[PDB]
Design a binder for these strands. Structure first.
Ligand SMILES: [Zn+2]
Ligand SMILES: [Zn+2]
Ligand SMILES: [Zn+2]
Ligand SMILES: [Zn+2]
Lengths: 187, 620, 586
RNA sequence: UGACUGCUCCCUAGCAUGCUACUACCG
RNA sequence: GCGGUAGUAGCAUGCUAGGGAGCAG
């Protein structure tokens, strides 16, 4: 309140009225002793009820503008994370076996369900039981999707390496059974 | 309807997104530029550019969400656990997710036992628990989609039912709204696949300006954007030891669907006195108003309610297209005939025949609803009215027309055959007449595949109105399920209310000077909700006493029950809230010299704060 | 929109607009630079302007706050607030405020329209951050003055070495010479298609580059101005004298390539930075080759600034150095590809300031520092920051192509920070052993500025010829001509067999091109031809004004030839301070 | 790892209205 | 004797936001 431009009048009117109490004041000067700090006090309160509103308004943009900054800084951290993805899932397209089906296409459009089926290098087979295993993945090589795949690893549900000799007809009760066979393309 | 039948002849690997190679600053990308629907045929995007330089924000959100790049950089997958078509494996390992048991609130159980509960041969037992699951739970729940079979419909009958069904939705308004008029609650919830890696829905609703959202929404009226859905197991109390999974759809789908449907989905939730009771409350007399609106002015009234076996998995793909075309009939000035197709194909490509993520692998959904889409409860109510109007057509048209004594219900049966099989355009004078016949003799109250019917009991016995046997025949050829008549109920005395609606029973009590209807729960559900929880929650009652004030509000109308073992569940909850308050105000006086004042706390163990929730003259 | 106040570095969020590049002036410091200059606009997280209906009132200093937008006096809501007041513009982080007594330079640097030498004098007496800001804004104003040119529309071509080109209406013809490489980009339908590196000859037309494009219909010739990136890393670091040799391994034997290089290792390996102050043709091209081989266990790099001057660093490289052991970088601008490309792991890296890989090193060489602006040093330090580096070059050479200053000449010291810091505290070394050069240049540069510290090595056989021909200059159009040059050259080769296999120097390429159209002479650059000087050369008058030949342009041009140096007087140039032979013209 | 909607109780911060006493000028 | 006007403190209502919790399909 030490810089409000209505402190001078209030201060002076207080001094004139209050400080001059000991001195004999007649009933005519008493009006000046009374109706001089009055009105001035009203105006000061008016000069303080507007300052309090300007302060709050001000401290509602120095908070709503930190939030406009925060979000743009964030908008630049996700815009650079999707970019770092769509350029890492691209360096992975064996562009000899992929430009060989987009080319044999009538216009260059192909179904998406035949891209991993004809242009992939690895196969993952998930097998529930032993009966399913001998009709799908018997031996070290097997044919699927008009191709030939050679087994490379057989992990299990626990993710521990199984060998192709632990898989018997009677040792089967001793394996975590969802078995995951990883195979590579041949030729 | 013809494409549905003809698409069972063609290889299943020809349906799905159609991809092509584009260049964005001299690098080859594979992106989706169309779709092949088993029902809508081949659709081609309208704004596709082959040579671009820079990708904006609205052009990176449409490239990350597409399955075209995720399923063209992952390994081939052959999954023999399921019989659904499988696309790719996104990683080198298969994820197995389990479900944990519940937590035991031993203090509440000790308190209840010390008050004469859980005695041998008691009426109230514990039947709701937290059931645990092993790692083969998500795939075994996904494999329940084998109940969705291709279904050809009767088109001359469905084209009339769809016109009697769009009269239950005539008192609402709807349309498209701008991105600044959209209301979202709980912005701290998931945002889908390709994105739950970087934040919740708040991040994507803040990073996108209003004009970005408007541009994205106007993009889908000329193009098709396929998305990926994630299947998530649930951790909740139940009575069946079977897993529950929900579908968390992507953010590009929800964001653009909320500007298409939200103006109508919030006018449905604001109408009182209609057939669809979504939005109405059970408190402050709402359950009495709802039950006296359905009773209307019927004559010889009986009450009926039925069941929908495997509702979301078995619902045909032609009754889910027909629900999106009834909700989109309100966009008749805001959108054009071509803008309303690309907003229909966009819905099918995203919530009807999409690609789902179960574990770390992509599968193909055969059909059926997704709980997680915006318009679910509202599209489940259009399907519930459609199956109850076609039961009333099949009951009147299969009734020997010579034995009908009445002469008004004999020319109304003679003009319905004409309107079905001898007319080709809509006759809006028999539709308005059948719609009044139904409303007069067959009154319904629908909440998202839960329904209660008050019907004439001297018309359903003659055969002029649907019965329970007429719902068991329609669900067999139109829905591919068998509805056993031991999951449906009937009620002859209307002073006892429906047997069950929304898991709640009904009872006629005397309140004030008049008799009202009050809903009450299953006691084993409210008792078992205080014993089994999720740690720090209620394994210490003093840290949350608001959980037991919101559970004694639900247990209040048990005080009026004729069984005295049911009326004790409410007095046990009022005696525990006081125990948890003496402790709290007595635990902060013996370790910290604090003295709490019991002023305005005694209202929660007095039976007058809860009695005011079931009396009209709403407050707050 | 939050960063370092160019000046105080504290975090701010503001940023003026006057400042084209738009720096992050702090809070307080805006009150100085905002009121104390025409510079008024301001942009913080949100832009400042009377959001009121299509207004147009700005100068934040006047604009007031209120509501949540801003309004000057335009229509200040009842609850306004001066946006501008107590030495601070309302902006994020207000207590970290400080500002600094530095609006001094800051204000002269901001206000300097870059027309007189005083702009460069005041720009060169400031602190490090002010120096960086001044260099950045100088490069900015110069490129944005340079892009003020239209397009060249081409629809047909007759044959090779011919083209009918015409600039736009109201836009003058871009300058003749090749200092502004014509990297054009035509259009096919929607985007920019490649053309190639080009350069013009005259308004016949010989293409002196190495490329061939299928030019025809719809071709658009343009001048490409690259969007300059903001500079971050400093251009230097204060030094400190150590005693311990860390990492460096002196060889067990003596690579006695040179004799005085032992003093070079004794004087250079001690301090944190130095400079090879070598006179022209006194070992300014292959001393670094010796340092490369005397310290094989230290990572050593070389950066350059021009594509032309790669002759000396390449000939001895094939003569006595391997191929695989060195490494080169070229993107897909154009240069030799003899060596290994794309090899981040090597001991002898050659690279140019156009593009470098982000890596650190311990010893670098930086050829032609005198051609390089402070921005060039700062960018080559930011892209590749290494422990020690030596700036090949000498201040006593030609100025950089600063076409922004015309009326006033450019003194050496104000070329860059190094070319004065090395004058004040003293040069780090001085050489006087010319490998292959007569002592004429030795005597000349000893009399001029060396004060006779290095003496004549080779006998002055008085083979240099100088005459008393002045010539007449005349200007007609944007390109200039010299009538007493088509005949003077013929009059000088009338009976001299020795220079029938000589080269031509081209101070002004226009006159040389005209004379080659009349008679026919190979064109040789003047600026980017240091170390490529032929044995037998002729110096032509070629100019009569103060535009190029005032003091510091002939020092390197009178030492091109080895045996026969014929350098005729062209102006008041030192004529009456020494003696000179003279063949009497017929 | 944690979807879409609807209802409802409790706590804190801000805005306007409603009967009063206090101020002070004004009638 | 009364009315109006502008601040200040105190008690309830409704609405708009944020936070925690309970139930239903
Ligand atoms: Zn619309
Ligand atoms: Zn400025
Ligand atoms: Zn204005
Ligand atoms: Zn500052």
């Amino acid at each position: 309140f030490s810089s409000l431009p209505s402190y001078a009048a209030f201060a002076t009117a207080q001094e004139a009225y209050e400080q001059a109490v000991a001195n004999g004041d007649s009933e005519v000067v008493l009006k000046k002793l009374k109706k001089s700090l009055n009105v001035a006090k009203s105006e000061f309160d008016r000069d303080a009820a507007m300052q309090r509103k300007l302060e709050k308004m001000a401290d509602q943009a120095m908070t709503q503008m930190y939030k406009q900054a925060r979000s743009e800084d964030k908008r630049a951290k996700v815009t650079s994370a999707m970019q770092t993805m769509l350029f890492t899932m691209l360096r992975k397209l064996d562009n000899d076996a992929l430009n060989n089906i987009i080319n044999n296409a009538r216009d260059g459009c192909v179904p998406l369900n035949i891209i991993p089926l004809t242009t992939a290098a690895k196969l993952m087979v998930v097998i529930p039981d032993y009966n399913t295993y001998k009709n799908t993945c018997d031996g070290t090589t097997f044919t699927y999707a008009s191709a030939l795949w050679e087994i490379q690893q057989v992990v299990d549900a626990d993710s521990k390496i199984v060998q192709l000799s632990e898989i018997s007809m009677d040792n089967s009760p001793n394996l975590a059974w969802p078995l995951i066979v990883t195979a590579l393309r041949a030729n | 309807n013809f494409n549905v039948l003809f698409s069972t002849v063609f290889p299943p690997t020809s349906f799905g997104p159609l991809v092509r190679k584009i260049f964005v600053d001299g690098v080859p990308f594979v992106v989706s530029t169309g779709y092949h629907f088993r029902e809508l045929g081949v659709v081609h995007n309208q704004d596709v550019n082959l040579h671009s330089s820079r990708l904006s924000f609205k052009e990176l959100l449409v490239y990350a969400a597409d399955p075209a790049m995720h399923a063209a950089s992952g390994n081939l997958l052959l999954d023999k656990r399921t019989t659904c078509f499988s696309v790719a494996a996104l990683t080198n390992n298969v994820a197995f997710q389990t479900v944990k048991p519940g937590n035991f609130n031993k203090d509440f159980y000790d308190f209840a036992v010390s008050k004469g509960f859980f005695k041998e041969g008691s009426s109230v037992e514990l039947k709701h628990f937290f059931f645990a699951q092993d790692g083969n739970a998500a795939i075994s729940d996904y494999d329940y989609y084998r109940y969705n079979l291709p279904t050809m419909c009767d088109i001359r009958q469905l084209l009339f039912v769809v016109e009697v069904v769009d009269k239950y939705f005539d008192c609402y308004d709807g349309g498209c709204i701008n991105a600044n008029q959209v209301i979202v609650n709980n912005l701290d919830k998931s945002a889908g696949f390709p994105f739950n890696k970087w934040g919740k829905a708040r991040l994507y609703y803040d990073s996108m300006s209003y004009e970005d959202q408007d541009a994205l929404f106007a993009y889908t009226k000329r193009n098709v954007i396929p998305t990926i859905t994630q299947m998530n197991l649930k951790y909740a109390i139940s009575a069946k030891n079977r897993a529950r999974t929900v579908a968390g759809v992507s953010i590009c789908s929800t964001m653009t669907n909320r500007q298409f449907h939200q103006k109508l989905l919030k006018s449905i939730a604001a109408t009182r006195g209609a057939t669809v009771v979504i939005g109405t409350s059970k408190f402050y007399g709402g359950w009495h108003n709802m039950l006296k609106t359905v009773y209307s002015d019927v004559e010889n009234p009986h009450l009926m309610g039925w069941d929908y076996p495997k509702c979301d998995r078995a619902m045909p793909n032609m009754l889910r297209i027909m629900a999106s075309l009834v909700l989109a009939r309100k966009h008749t000035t805001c959108c054009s005939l071509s803008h309303r197709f690309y907003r229909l194909a966009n819905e099918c490509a995203q919530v009807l025949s999409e690609m789902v993520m179960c574990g770390g692998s992509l599968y193909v959904k055969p059909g059926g609803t997704s709980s997680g889409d915006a318009t679910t409860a509202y599209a489940n109510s259009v399907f519930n009215i459609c199956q109850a109007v076609t039961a009333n057509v099949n009951a009147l048209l299969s009734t020997d027309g010579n034995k009908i004594a009445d002469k008004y219900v004999r020319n109304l049966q003679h003009r319905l055959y004409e309107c079905l099989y001898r007319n080709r355009d809509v006759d809006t004078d028999f539709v308005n007449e059948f719609y009044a016949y139904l409303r007069k003799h067959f009154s319904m109250m629908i909440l998202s595949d839960d329904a209660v019917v008050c019907f004439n009991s001297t018309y359903a016995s003659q055969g002029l109105v649907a019965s329970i046997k007429n719902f068991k025949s329609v669900l067999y050829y139109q829905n591919n399920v068998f509805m056993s008549e031991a999951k449906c109920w009937t009620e002859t005395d209307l002073t006892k209310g429906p047997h069950e609606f929304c898991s709640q029973h009904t009872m006629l009590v005397k309140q004030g000077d008049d008799y009202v209807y009050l809903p009450y729960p299953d006691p084993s559900r409210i008792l078992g909700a205080g014993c089994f929880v999720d740690d720090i929650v209620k394994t210490d009652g003093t840290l949350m006493i608001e959980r037991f004030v919101s559970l004694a509000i639900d247990a209040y109308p048990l005080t009026k029950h004729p069984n005295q073992e049911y009326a004790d569940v409410f007095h046990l909850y009022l005696q525990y809230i006081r125990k948890l308050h003496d402790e709290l105000t007595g635990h902060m006086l013996d370790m910290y010299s604090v003295m709490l004042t019991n002023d305005n706390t005694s209202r929660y163990w007095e039976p007058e704060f809860y009695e005011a929730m079931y009396t009209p003259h709403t407050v707050l | 929109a939050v960063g370092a106040c160019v000046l105080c570095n504290s975090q701010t969020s503001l940023r003026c607009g006057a400042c084209i590049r738009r720096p992050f002036l702090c809070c307080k410091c805006c009150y100085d630079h905002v009121i104390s200059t025409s510079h008024k606009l301001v942009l913080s997280v949100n832009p400042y302007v009377c959001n009121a209906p299509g207004c147009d009132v700005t100068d934040v200093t006047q604009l007031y706050l209120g509501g949540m937008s801003y309004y000057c006096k335009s229509h200040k809501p009842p609850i306004s607030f001066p946006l501008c007041a107590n030495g601070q513009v309302f902006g994020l982080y207000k207590n970290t405020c400080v500002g600094s007594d530095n609006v001094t330079d800051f204000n002269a640097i901001a206000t300097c329209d870059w027309t007189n030498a005083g702009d460069y004098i005041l720009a060169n007496t400031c602190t490090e951050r002010l120096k960086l800001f001044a260099a950045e804004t100088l490069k900015a104003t110069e490129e944005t003055f340079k892009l003020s040119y239209g397009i060249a529309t081409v629809r047909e071509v007759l044959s090779d070495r011919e083209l009918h080109l015409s600039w736009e209406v109201g836009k003058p013809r871009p300058p003749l010479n090749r200092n502004y490489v014509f990297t054009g980009y035509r259009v096919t339908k929607n985007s920019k298609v490649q053309i190639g590196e080009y350069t013009f000859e005259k308004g016949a037309v010989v293409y002196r580059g190495t490329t061939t494009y299928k030019l025809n219909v719809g071709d658009y010739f343009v001048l490409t101005s690259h969007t300059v990136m903001p500079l971050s890393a400093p251009t230097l670091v204060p030094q400190e004298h150590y005693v311990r040799i860390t990492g460096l391994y002196p060889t067990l034997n003596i690579s006695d390539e040179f004799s005085s290089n032992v003093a070079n290792y004794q004087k250079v390996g001690m301090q944190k930075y130095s400079t090879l102050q070598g006179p022209p043709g006194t070992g300014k091209s292959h001393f670094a080759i010796g340092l490369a081989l005397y310290y094989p266990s230290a990572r050593i790099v070389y950066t350059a600034c021009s594509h032309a001057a790669v002759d000396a660093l390449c000939e001895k490289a094939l003569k006595y150095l391997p191929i695989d052991k060195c490494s080169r970088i070229i993107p897909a601008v154009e240069c030799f590809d003899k060596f290994k490309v794309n090899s981040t792991l090597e001991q002898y890296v050659f690279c140019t300031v156009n593009a470098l890989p982000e890596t650190t090193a311990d010893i670098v060489v930086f050829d032609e520092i005198s051609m390089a602006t402070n921005y060039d040093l700062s960018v080559v330090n930011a892209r590749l920051r290494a422990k020690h580096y030596v700036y090949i070059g000498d201040p006593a050479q030609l100025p950089a192509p600063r076409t922004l200053l015309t009326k006033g000449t450019l003194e050496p010291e104000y070329f860059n920070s190094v070319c004065r810091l090395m004058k004040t505290i003293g040069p780090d070394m001085f050489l006087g052993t010319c490998r292959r050069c007569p002592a004429e240049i030795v005597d000349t540069v000893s009399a001029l500025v060396y004060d006779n510290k290095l003496k004549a090595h080779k006998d002055k056989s008085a083979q240099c010829f100088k005459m008393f021909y002045k010539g007449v200059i005349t200007h007609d159009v944007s390109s200039a001509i010299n009538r007493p040059q088509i005949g003077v050259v013929r009059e000088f080769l009338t009976r001299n067999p020795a220079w029938r296999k000589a080269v031509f120097i081209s101070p002004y390429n226009s006159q040389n091109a005209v004379a080659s159209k009349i008679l026919g002479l190979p064109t040789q650059t003047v600026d980017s031809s240091q170390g490529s000087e032929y044995d037998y050369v002729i110096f032509t008058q070629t100019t009569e004004t103060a535009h190029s030949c005032n003091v510091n342009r002939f020092n390197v041009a009178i030492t091109r030839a080895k045996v026969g140096i014929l350098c005729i007087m062209s102006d008041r140039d030192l004529y009456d301070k020494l003696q000179f032979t003279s063949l009497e013209i017929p």
